[PDB]
Design an enzyme around this catalytic site. Structure first.
Site, PDB file in Angstrom:
ATOM      1  N   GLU B 128       0.766  -1.246   0.000  1.00  0.00           N
ATOM      2  CA  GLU B 128       0.000   0.000   0.000  1.00  0.00           C
ATOM      3  C   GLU B 128       0.803   1.306   0.000  1.00  0.00           C
ATOM      4  O   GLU B 128       0.672   2.124   0.914  1.00  0.00           O
ATOM      5  CB  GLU B 128      -0.950  -0.018   1.199  1.00  0.00           C
ATOM      6  CG  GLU B 128      -1.683  -1.350   1.346  1.00  0.00           C
ATOM      7  CD  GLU B 128      -2.470  -1.455   2.632  1.00  0.00           C
ATOM      8  OE1 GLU B 128      -2.286  -0.589   3.513  1.00  0.00           O
ATOM      9  OE2 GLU B 128      -3.269  -2.411   2.768  1.00  0.00           O
ATOM     10  N   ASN B 170       1.853  -5.049  -3.478  1.00  0.00           N
ATOM     11  CA  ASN B 170       0.484  -5.340  -3.062  1.00  0.00           C
ATOM     12  C   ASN B 170      -0.269  -4.059  -2.678  1.00  0.00           C
ATOM     13  O   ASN B 170       0.292  -3.182  -2.019  1.00  0.00           O
ATOM     14  CB  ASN B 170       0.542  -6.319  -1.874  1.00  0.00           C
ATOM     15  CG  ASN B 170      -0.807  -6.921  -1.529  1.00  0.00           C
ATOM     16  OD1 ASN B 170      -1.466  -7.533  -2.374  1.00  0.00           O
ATOM     17  ND2 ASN B 170      -1.222  -6.760  -0.275  1.00  0.00           N
ATOM     18  N   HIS B 207     -10.575  -6.013  -1.854  1.00  0.00           N
ATOM     19  CA  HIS B 207     -11.505  -5.861  -0.743  1.00  0.00           C
ATOM     20  C   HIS B 207     -12.677  -5.102  -1.358  1.00  0.00           C
ATOM     21  O   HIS B 207     -12.643  -3.878  -1.488  1.00  0.00           O
ATOM     22  CB  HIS B 207     -10.873  -5.055   0.400  1.00  0.00           C
ATOM     23  CG  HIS B 207      -9.806  -5.801   1.145  1.00  0.00           C
ATOM     24  ND1 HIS B 207     -10.061  -6.962   1.847  1.00  0.00           N
ATOM     25  CD2 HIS B 207      -8.483  -5.552   1.295  1.00  0.00           C
ATOM     26  CE1 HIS B 207      -8.940  -7.393   2.400  1.00  0.00           C
ATOM     27  NE2 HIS B 207      -7.969  -6.556   2.081  1.00  0.00           N
ATOM     28  N   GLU B 236      -6.195 -10.691  -1.065  1.00  0.00           N
ATOM     29  CA  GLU B 236      -6.962 -10.577   0.180  1.00  0.00           C
ATOM     30  C   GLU B 236      -8.455 -10.446  -0.077  1.00  0.00           C
ATOM     31  O   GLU B 236      -9.153  -9.665   0.575  1.00  0.00           O
ATOM     32  CB  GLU B 236      -6.461  -9.362   0.967  1.00  0.00           C
ATOM     33  CG  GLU B 236      -4.958  -9.387   1.224  1.00  0.00           C
ATOM     34  CD  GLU B 236      -4.455  -8.140   1.938  1.00  0.00           C
ATOM     35  OE1 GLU B 236      -5.269  -7.443   2.581  1.00  0.00           O
ATOM     36  OE2 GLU B 236      -3.240  -7.866   1.862  1.00  0.00           O
ATOM     37  N   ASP B 238     -12.340 -10.526  -0.261  1.00  0.00           N
ATOM     38  CA  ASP B 238     -13.510 -10.640   0.601  1.00  0.00           C
ATOM     39  C   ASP B 238     -14.516  -9.690  -0.021  1.00  0.00           C
ATOM     40  O   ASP B 238     -14.150  -8.609  -0.506  1.00  0.00           O
ATOM     41  CB  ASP B 238     -13.247 -10.327   2.089  1.00  0.00           C
ATOM     42  CG  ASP B 238     -12.468  -9.048   2.325  1.00  0.00           C
ATOM     43  OD1 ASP B 238     -12.626  -8.072   1.568  1.00  0.00           O
ATOM     44  OD2 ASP B 238     -11.706  -9.030   3.317  1.00  0.00           O
TER      45      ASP B 238
END
Ligand code: GAL
Ligand code: GAL
Ligand code: GAL
Ligand code: GAL
Lengths: 427, 427
Positions: B128, B170, B207, B236, B238
């Site tokens: 990030e 990432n 996300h 990641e 979700d």
């Protein structure tokens, strides 16, 4: 008034109450709602047998009194729950049988009612005495084994202790007229009235769910008992899933029967419920009014496309796209799928069948869009009678940005001002 | 194989992993699902900076090694997360700046990668580093303030420390191709490839929620990055609401890109998620498979009325009734609304728009009926590729009582057996 449940119910001479837990009275979020919305209170556990008579002949009203004091200080009446019951009996009583148990039952009634003499509106004298085995007969318990006349004795004893209180019999699964249990209770009450046994009311707990769903014949059940010359009341209402239609239906059933004294929901917030997993109450864990709340309030008060009054335009999904994140707008009304909104029992506003009006935030200026329906409180809405549409999670109103009125005007969440750009009508 | 996510993904040379928390390795329900369904593991927190270097120079790999060993012992590869990040830095590192910090960063990288030298499949070297303000530029952090070339330095350092591992950048909110942040990252990777900077992969956290929804152009983003000569991975994943369609869409986007190494969901059960409130994962708190699970598996394995195979008749609501509690049956098929079921993204089988196929219990012989939709797990179903329909809450199959085939044959839940009275075909 007509902005709170209790005040709305009072407009028809009825009450709307809740069950109060003394251990939660220190929670201002809990009490704020409770004191404001209800005008009748039932102690959830504080007036039960084990709580009021821990040791034989030794009464303790400390927990019960905390609930009672709070109720009266906040202008509410109180239902006493409960004097004789096979469940939640203190250890010493569970060990009793025969005449010894019978006398202890009598002593308990005299002790508890003496303390609250003249202070309680209704008492659930006997609770859940009937079986669920489908025979419509008596439940087997230590109390029933003292003699079939135990229920009658409890009532006669209660009337002598406090003749000012209404004496009720209370049970569950006696709402559907066709059930054997319902009819077994009816016959008992009929017998009592003919032989002069003092009984003034019948409480229908009303715990509805998938296994024991609400049925419209509940209204005939209420009428039938009322015809026997007893008042009736919904005492522990909760509905699995909290369907707005079912909640409104139960409310209207009570409003249709002159002898229906009022309604008590079993708890304040879903999280305070003994069945929190079923989110069966009128307020969610956050203390926000759910869609069912509005449905109930509207029924107590007497109670397709969505077009804004201040613009005359309809809530529209741009280019009729089905892409998540598409912000909705105002646009010339015309029978088109992207303008057809369905309000569900859960309080969702659906479009295309599986897309939901969605709030991507909780603050002012939050973008109102469509997103796959999943059940979040940010996809739940309350359609007020004043024409405003409030988001359950945010508590904010659907607002046409800058009061715009022309096509393309975007929809957001903003403090409710009841402006014309916040009022909508369903056509 | 094709009965588990990991095995199904392996068919196309890909992997399906999850984030593992060492604190839950003691929960047998947690490990049973994790060891069975996934073949790739990411330490949720154990390999972060604050966890691996509490004090400058003093390395601790106790928690990290615990996760790594469990992973390898159970047949899973491991993604290292993460070496350079502005968040979760230990107290001492937060104080540093300038060349001092730059050196600290380098030492940390050599320390961590040295310990796991040649044991990690992929490393999120930098995490990030871009802003969410909309400019598409670097994030203002203590690392960025040491020199715009810190990222490049991190990747150069990492490559030297362990040339066997794939080095990834990432980040989140870089899934939608039209976003400025997505463009910033793209320009950087393009630049790195031209100047020989060692970067092997780009991780897309994925996300998704109503605030940052999935968009089909995600596939285009993946293909554009892959075209630069780097591998891509969903790291990641979700999804708020766990929509079946969206989960399947993301899965298919990866399968459509040869350089998409695999998918990692950020957690095992919804209750294990950092966003449990959004029920964004594939298994619920009970550890049972959700509707989205089946959709993902079906996607990995390649790729209206509900008619019973053994009876040739359709799932029907008697007399087109809409009352809650009405048990469904089998009946001659015909275009009528009481035979048209809609399978929603949440996993419900709806009829009449707002009524749900409902299981009034969890054991064998449980009555299957319609009830107001409210989102309970007893109203969620999984349509398996074999034709069976399983209840999410019960894990039992829709079953035509006694294998009956005539009109009026009732439907119930029953232990799955692959019988014809348990197989259905959607028309
Ligand atoms: O503003 C774009 C317009 O696109 C049309 O296709 C639609 O029918 C209108 O309702 C409006 O959405
Ligand atoms: O900024 C949005 C707000 O702008 C105000 O001028 C208007 O009165 C509000 O209803 C709302 O539209
Ligand atoms: O057996 C009852 C039948 O009643 C009919 O009215 C209906 O169209 C059929 O689908 C079936 O429900
Ligand atoms: O009794 C219920 C059971 O009866 C069996 O004959 C049938 O094969 C099972 O699927 C189930 O219907």
């Amino acid at each position: 008034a007509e902005s709170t449940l209790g005040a709305a119910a009072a407009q028809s001479g009825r009450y709307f109450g809740t069950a109060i837990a003394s251990g939660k009275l220190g929670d201002s979020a809990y009490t704020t709602i409770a004191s404001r919305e209800f005008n009748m209170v039932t102690a959830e556990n504080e007036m039960k047998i084990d709580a009021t008579e821990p040791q034989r002949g030794q009464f303790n009203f400390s927990a019960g009194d905390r609930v009672y004091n709070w109720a009266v200080q906040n202008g509410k009446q109180v239902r006493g729950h409960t004097l004789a019951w096979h469940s939640q009996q203190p250890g010493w009583m569970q060990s009793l049988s025969g005449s010894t148990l019978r006398q202890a039952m009598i002593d308990h009634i005299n002790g508890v009612m003496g303390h609250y003499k003249g202070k309680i509106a209704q008492w659930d004298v006997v609770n859940e005495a009937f079986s669920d085995d489908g025979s419509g007969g008596r439940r087997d318990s230590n109390l029933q084994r003292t003699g079939n006349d135990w229920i009658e004795v409890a009532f006669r004893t209660a009337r002598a202790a406090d003749p000012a209180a209404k004496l009720c019999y209370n049970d569950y699964n006696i709402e559907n007229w066709t059930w054997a249990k319902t009819q077994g209770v009816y016959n008992m009450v009929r017998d009592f009235k003919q032989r002069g046994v003092p009984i003034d009311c019948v409480g229908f707990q009303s715990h509805f769910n998938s296994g024991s769903p609400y049925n419209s014949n509940f209204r005939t059940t209420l009428q039938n008992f009322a015809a026997l010359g007893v008042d009736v009341a919904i005492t522990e209402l909760d509905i699995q899933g909290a369907s707005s239609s079912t909640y409104a239906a139960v409310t209207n059933d009570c409003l249709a029967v002159s002898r229906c004294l009022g309604i008590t929901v079993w708890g304040v917030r879903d999280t305070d419920s003994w069945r929190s997993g079923d989110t069966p109450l009128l307020f969610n864990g956050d203390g926000s009014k759910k869609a069912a709340y509005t449905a109930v309030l509207n029924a107590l008060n007497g109670g397709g496309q969505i077009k804004g009054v201040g613009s005359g335009r309809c809530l529209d999904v741009p280019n009729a796209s089905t892409t998540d994140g598409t912000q909705v707008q105002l646009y010339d009304c015309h029978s088109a799928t992207n303008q057809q909104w369905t309000y569900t029992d859960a309080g969702e506003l659906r479009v295309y069948g599986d897309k939901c009006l969605d709030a991507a935030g909780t603050g002012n200026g939050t973008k109102v869009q469509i997103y796959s329906c999943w059940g979040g409180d940010n996809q739940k809405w309350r359609l007020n009678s004043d024409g405003s549409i409030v988001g359950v999670q945010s508590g904010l109103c659907l607002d046409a940005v800058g009061g715009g009125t022309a096509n393309g005007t975007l929809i957001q969440l903003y403090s409710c001002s009841n402006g014309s750009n916040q009022r909508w009508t369903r056509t």
